[PDB]
Symmetry: D2
Subunit: 268 residues, 4 copies
């Protein structure tokens, strides 16, 4: 008997089999959830990736910058899960920032057109997904997004840090709106996981400093985490998200759960 038996959950943000969203979906399925997946831009590729999941699941296009995709999303989900059924959970596992807002590119040289795009996708879209999907969510349901602790500044993450600070504020407002429907909204602040975004976005922006990134991640997380931290294992983050999709954190909303091995609780 699974933790998410007969729960219908939408999971956004799969692009490879390392994606945090991919492992969220895998664990959600292992625990009995029926999924609907959304993907951006490269749907042929994403389709081959989602075939490696333990179960088949419908896949829908969603570019969170596209008003038409958002306006139609609720309709397309209803059609995929059966007319008269609703969602019990929604997972926002999406982010973007142009190269200029990251890495060794100077912080002050990022033009606002680039920063604005990153905040649109990384923070505002949390509200636009909730707006589109709350009308088809059941009471008891849960919305979850992915965060990276932005309360202190750090090298390289630069304007993505600013986007996450924004996302944290958005989550608290979404929680107010979602409360009317009996729905929780929370973020999971994950420790670092090797994914495409880590490597191509953050690691690409670092140039020949990429060694520096690993060293910092080692300092900031495995060394600090009292139970350690393994950047090649997304399972603990995925389980944490499933905990929030479940009935087992029923009194938590507008909040942030840290799945970082405890690193943020330790100074060194």
């Amino acid at each position: 008997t699974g933790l998410l038996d007969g729960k219908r959950i939408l999971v956004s943000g799969i692009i490879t089999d390392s994606s945090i969203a991919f492992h969220i979906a895998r664990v959600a399925q292992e625990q009995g959830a029926q999924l609907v997946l959304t993907g951006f831009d490269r749907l042929r590729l994403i389709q081959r990736i989602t075939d490696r999941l333990p179960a088949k699941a419908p896949l829908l296009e969603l570019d969170v910058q596209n008003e038409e995709h958002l306006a139609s999303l609720a309709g397309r989900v209803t059609e995929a899960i059966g007319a008269g059924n609703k969602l019990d959970g929604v997972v926002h596992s999406i982010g973007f920032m142009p190269q200029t807002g990251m890495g060794i590119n100077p912080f002050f040289d990022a033009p606002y057109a680039d920063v604005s795009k990153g905040i649109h996708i990384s923070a505002y879209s949390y509200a636009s997904m909730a707006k589109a999907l709350l009308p088809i969510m059941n009471p008891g349901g849960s919305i979850v997004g992915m965060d990276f602790d932005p309360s202190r500044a750090m090298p390289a993450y630069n304007w993505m840090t600013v986007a996450k600070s924004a996302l944290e504020s958005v989550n608290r407002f979404v929680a107010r709106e979602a409360g009317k429907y009996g729905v929780r909204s929370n973020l999971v602040a994950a420790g670092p996981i090797r994914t495409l975004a880590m490597s191509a976005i953050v690691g690409g922006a670092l140039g020949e400093e990429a060694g520096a990134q690993i060293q910092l991640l080692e300092e900031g997380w495995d060394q600090r985490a009292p139970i350690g931290w393994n950047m090649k294992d997304a399972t603990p983050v995925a389980k944490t998200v499933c905990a929030l999709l479940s009935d087992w954190l029923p009194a938590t909303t507008g909040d942030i759960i840290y799945a970082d091995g405890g690193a943020h609780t330790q100074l060194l």
Copy 2:
């Protein structure tokens, strides 16, 4: 469901069937946990109270101020759960503060002897329980204590606030020690629940200020919580603790989970 199937968990802090610990134990048992219970001072009464749980469970004396009780605790638990078995979870649901450190008694008039006693039982005992029990916990295990958000001052809670600020710090250190054993340590910051200790804050169930207390608790929690808050329902807090005793938050330690309906995330 079986969230805690075949997990052996020690639960401290039962005194009535309204105790947060009582509901923690009930839900743990409903989810398949084999419990060991500890009780303070009034064991005859506590025995009759624990009989109302869904399953029988051994009951052990533990006054956290008593060195002998603590020195023997590990031994007595091993005897109750079977030689060669260990605990998978531990719940600290314990607190105390003398009357002088609370309510309308002026903050500056609490003598240190009284405050010290309250900090001993409410904060330091979180470390002494961990010290006694870690040697008989399995890797994967979880220690959980109960908090009330002390980051801002408030009427009446007075020196208990100071004890909770201390407990929050103790938890982060216990997390470091527990990490060596592959064990997590976390607090649940609960919203207010009608218990015997709550009445104590204002001098018993008809204290001068009882009416004021209820109004403030409604202002601070049900009115702020986006999903609302019901002070007569401990279940959501109990489920939140079981979430932490389970395998489903494996990467969270040294931390605090808020089970307050989201109230601490909202200003008004």
Copy 3:
């Protein structure tokens, strides 16, 4: 001897004589600072307002959305304070959010074009000002922006809350950049002050707004809070522009009567 004797400080954000920036400038001047002022859009009006300050001060146009204004700003400031002199302080006291992102307008109905504009002006501009001005700041100097505590959600402030959360993060990054020049960057999280922007949050129910501000601030503040008195906020900013908080950067000072430290 005044607290800012012979310090050259740029102050942005004056629009009326209730503007927080206006009272910052007044106090800075009372304490011996030579000011340069910047104003947006309504410079004729702003000029008449700045005439009510204790001392005359040059006034420069700056729309923080305008790349040309920002590119020329350093040059225009050098010309106004004398070639070979630099700034010792900079005050960002600027904000904006379209009506759709605020008040009773549902949170979800604000389009991103509107939210983006508000974040541009209210948060990103803190970085673009620092970028423009750091090259002409002296070691020891201080940059200060105005914040409103966004760590918990609230009625009406809506997307401005999100812009302030962003500003807080921007400040921490600016602090890193400013450190290279020996310059501090901090925000002052003020309690509520009756200004033109405050009326904008709703328009001018206003009754509800005042009640909430009394609940959230005067009632919680252990030393009380008076929304018609900007002086304490202005002094707190001058403290940060002075030499007296030399080891504080990337940080937030709360000038709210202590309200954020009390739950009820």
Copy 4:
């Protein structure tokens, strides 16, 4: 001319000319304050140390664990500053923790009698000092204590971390009491300064680890602080305290000002 012209300020916590309190007093005096000083245990020594201040100032015995010293303190201060005059400021720069609660001594082995003592002196005494002195403080006045950021756990500081978490909570309650008198109460969270407490208490407790751990700390502070940090220079901390004793932060109470070079705002 001076920032504290004609302000009468009590400064506790001088033991050597490296003490943070000694530099607070020096700068206060340079800025025109008339001081009253308090000292613990070694008054002969403290007297020779205070002679090296720019101005003479009366010195009073105060062991914050002694009820008689506290009961008589207001009276003795009135006598020293002139009957009818009051204090405008009070500086608590006092701390203690037994060796067992610090360094490489295991966290769980500190007996509560030792931790209690440390909390008494390091946290509760901030309330007793305020209780004794508020009745002779002018409206506008300021109380200030010294903190070391305890929001995350760390090596070695151990139970002192817990005492600082307690102090932070006590400061918020003192702010409530002090508000009735028109008085502010705040802490300054200083970066690390080479003082007797650093070397004898913390450094002593580290044993053979003292040298390396302290060097890494000095490197990592200075590394995180965007404006850098020099552990041999107390002046910036002393100035920060004088800012709070002055009229220039009139709307800040119950709060914490970080004088750490910005280090706590940066993760790495």
